[PDB]
Ligand binder design. Structure first.
Ligand SMILES: O=c1ccn([C@@H]2O[C@H](COP(=O)(O)OP(=O)(O)O)[C@@H](O)[C@H]2O)c(=O)[nH]1
Ligand SMILES: O=c1ccn([C@@H]2O[C@H](COP(=O)(O)OP(=O)(O)O)[C@@H](O)[C@H]2O)c(=O)[nH]1
Ligand SMILES: [Mn+2]
Ligand SMILES: [Mn+2]
Ligand code: NA
Ligand code: NA
Ligand code: NA
Length: 522
């Protein structure tokens, strides 16, 4: 049995052909450069014309993202994004959902292809009854050399989870995919069934999706080969433990609670799983995000709070000159400490990013201390990637994106929105992009930041006087981006020149004395 027999099966059936909302197909990729163009091509060939194709590359080390970026330049139907650390297909999926604009959401993996009528037929079945919330069709495993069918538990094709399509409102009503490495398509399907009722999912029993069979893929811990055209598929022990867990959770949790249990972005495991099942950063100390904001940027601050609010344990928000506290701030509740300054005479401006740091050190409380600015668009993977990078240096250094190397025309600037191919030590980090572990510092007085408006310089001096390196970390182009939206260096100079030495002369002693720091310099 071959892919041709599957196509013959579809051509004998009129299911879904008699009838246009925008459909978003979400694709994730991890080191699939050999396959991804054929995958995308099968989607561009859909008979259903009103599509967009959303690609999220999960930090591939091959040139997968180069290829996807090229294709996006050949057609406006394809939009591509890259995560700056490996977080797993469900994190990448959820990121793609946030980027998507369609009213109806389908999926396709970057190593597969599908039938040119998959979206048309599934959409028409989905929309046949207004009570239907989702649809799915059948898949087959295909040997990529011969395109012969690999039967799964004695069936040429069977209903799957990758073939699900559903109304966009599902994610706002029941939350997002659980951010594991595997098994969460099964959980999400059962979450839909639990919340909406299993009859509100329609099955289209046609072989319209073709799963490539390849070594070391996610599902191969389930596979027993019987012969060249037959496998048995059975949950592994860790997969079964996860299923037993989420099945109990579905029975123990009110269905209107799913939305809160499975928020996205996130940094902590929603369900307890072993390390093989999660790539989340799962910090073992709290995460503290600190931000200052002026009222001209209230629209930017809304977007920032919305993307960051579930990437931390607690906000410190210094509102400088806002008249009233925005609803999106008050809705944080006691998750935020809001300092509201009304008199510009009392304002400390950007020094407000470091109010909490003094409090934590005074209380001997540790944490990941994050400083942000209200004119930057932060990505969904931001905090997970930053903590992973701190951990890569055993939390011994400060990291950031916006970096400056001194010897003002001779300064080298590593703008946070431009690419950087490897980590590099620098002299000053922009404090809208900094992350570090609090307990690097055993004493700190914010009053030492005498003048406002120069927090990057003062923070750099705090690092230098404590023999702490500042690392400008690698990232793709536009991982972060600016949204300034239309919103006298005499003290800086005096402070810079009075606090020599700079350049590589302040860096090289630190770099030379620790084997994990050696590649940070030419
Ligand atoms: O860390 C990872 C591993 C996999 N994938 C993607 O997740 C999808 C499903 O993985 P796979 O093809 O291995 O699944 P299987 O064929 O085993 O069901 C594919 O687009 C993979 O490239 C990903 O984004 N991140
Ligand atoms: O009077 C001011 C000026 C700036 N800021 C905040 O300080 C940070 C840095 O401001 P800006 O983006 O203007 O600095 P730049 O990026 O130009 O160095 C931002 O979060 C601003 O909201 C503030 O609270 N008060
Ligand atoms: Mn696959
Ligand atoms: Mn700025
Ligand atoms: Na590779
Ligand atoms: Na199941
Ligand atoms: Na983890």
């Amino acid at each position: 049995t071959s892919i041709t027999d599957l196509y013959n099966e579809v051509a004998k059936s009129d299911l879904g052909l008699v009838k246009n909302p925008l459909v978003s197909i979400i694709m994730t990729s991890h080191n699939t450069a050999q396959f991804i163009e054929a995958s995308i091509n099968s989607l561009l060939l859909q008979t259903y014309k009103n599509i967009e194709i959303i690609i999220v590359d999960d930090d591939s080390s091959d040139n997968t993202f180069e290829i996807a970026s090229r294709i996006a330049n050949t057609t406006s139907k394809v939009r591509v994004f890259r995560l700056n650390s490996n977080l797993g297909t469900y994190f990448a999926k959820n990121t793609g959902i946030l980027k998507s604009k369609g009213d109806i959401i389908f999926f396709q993996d970057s190593d597969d292809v599908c039938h040119h009528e998959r979206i048309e037929r599934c959409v028409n079945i989905l929309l046949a009854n207004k009570e239907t919330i989702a649809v799915r069709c059948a898949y087959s495993r295909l040997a990529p050399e011969t395109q012969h069918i690999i039967k799964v538990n004695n069936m040429d094709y069977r209903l799957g989870f990758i073939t699900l399509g559903m109304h966009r409102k599902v994610f706002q009503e029941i939350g997002f995919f659980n951010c594991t490495t595997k098994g969460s398509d099964d959980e999400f399907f059962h979450r839909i069934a639990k919340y909406y009722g299993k009859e509100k999912i329609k099955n289209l029993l046609l072989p319209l999706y073709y799963n490539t069979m390849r070594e070391n893929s996610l599902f191969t811990d389930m596979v027993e080969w019987i012969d060249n055209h037959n496998i048995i598929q059975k949950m592994s022990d860790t997969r079964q433990h996860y299923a037993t867990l989420f099945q109990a959770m579905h029975n123990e949790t009110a269905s209107h609670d799913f939305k809160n249990l499975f928020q996205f972005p996130r940094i902590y495991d929603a369900l307890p799983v072993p390390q093989e099942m999660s790539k989340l950063s799962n910090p073992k100390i709290p995460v503290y995000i600190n931000i200052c904001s002026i009222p001209s940027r209230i629209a930017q601050l809304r977007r920032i709070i919305g993307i960051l609010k579930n990437q931390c344990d607690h906000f410190h928000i210094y509102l400088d000159g806002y008249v009233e506290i925005p609803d999106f701030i008050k809705n944080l509740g006691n998750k935020a400490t809001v300092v509201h300054c009304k008199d510009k005479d009392n304002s400390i401006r950007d020094n407000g990013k470091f109010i909490l740091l003094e409090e934590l050190i005074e209380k001997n409380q540790d944490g990941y201390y994050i400083t942000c600015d209200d004119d930057i668009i932060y990505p969904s993977d931001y905090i997970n990637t930053m903590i992973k990078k701190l951990n890569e240096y055993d939390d011994k250094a400060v990291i950031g994106l916006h970096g400056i190397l001194f010897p003002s025309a001779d300064r080298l600037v590593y703008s946070f929105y431009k690419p950087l191919e490897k980590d590099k030590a620098v002299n000053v980090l922009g404090t809208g992009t900094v992350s570090f572990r609090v307990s690097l510092f055993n004493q700190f007085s914010l009053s030492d930041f005498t003048h406002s408006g120069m927090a990057d310089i003062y923070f750099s001096l705090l690092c230098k006087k404590n023999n702490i390196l500042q690392i400008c970390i690698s990232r793709p182009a536009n991982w972060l981006t600016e949204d300034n939206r239309d919103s006298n260096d005499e003290q800086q100079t005096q402070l810079i020149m009075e606090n020599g030495p700079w350049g590589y002369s302040s860096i090289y002693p630190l770099v030379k004395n620790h084997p994990k720091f050696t590649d940070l310099i030419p």
